[PDB]
Design a protein around this ligand. Structure first.
Ligand SMILES: Cc1noc(CNC(=O)c2cccc(C(=O)O)c2)n1
Length: 167
């Protein structure tokens, strides 16, 4: 048993809820929250901007030090950093950005990072301002992630469409 509440069960291991991931992280304080990162860990907008704002910019300060030491992530890659006030850890995962022309096949590689963690609170990778079809992102998630993933979908209209179209 874990502390996640109000989720619809899609599969053995994937759960979904209409929720603000920031508000969900603050309530649950999960072991791992996933950020929809870019390779520079520049948390300007979307999920990343919202998570970073909720940390009072401490996520961005830590991220800048990480990039200064290690250089950029790979598209499809990840790093584990602090979860600050939101979670124990933040798994920064880079899905392909369609609005930059990145290979959508890299979305499966992105979701494979989740398998290194037993339980995660996450957004749909490459959705929102990353430009991919969220229905596709949910299908890749279900077909790739084997660990227990709690998906937060901000937009109520999209949530209802994801549930009602789920195979
Ligand atoms: C802190 C703070 N500052 O502004 C906001 C408003 N919340 C969002 O922007 C938001 C939340 C969850 C997911 C997404 C997304 O883009 O999928 C976006 N929270």
């Amino acid at each position: 048993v874990n502390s996640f509440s109000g989720y619809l069960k899609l599969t053995d291991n994937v759960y979904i809820k209409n929720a603000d991931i920031v508000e969900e992280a603050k309530k649950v304080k999960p072991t791992v929250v996933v950020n929809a990162a870019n390779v520079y860990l520049k948390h300007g907008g979307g999920v990343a901007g919202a998570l970073n704002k909720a940390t009072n910019n401490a996520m961005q300060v830590e991220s800048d030090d990480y990039i200064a030491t290690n250089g950029p992530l790979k598209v499809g890659g990840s790093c584990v950093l602090s979860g600050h006030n939101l979670a124990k850890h933040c798994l920064h995962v880079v899905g392909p950005n369609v609005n930059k022309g990145e290979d959508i096949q890299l979305l499966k590689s992105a979701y494979e990072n989740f398998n290194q963690h037993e339980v995660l609170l996450a957004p749909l990778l490459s959705a929102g301002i990353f430009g991919a079809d969220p229905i596709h992102s949910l299908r890749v998630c279900v077909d790739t992630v084997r660990t227990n993933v709690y998906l937060a979908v901000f937009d109520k209209n999209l949530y209802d469409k994801l549930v009602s179209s789920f195979l």
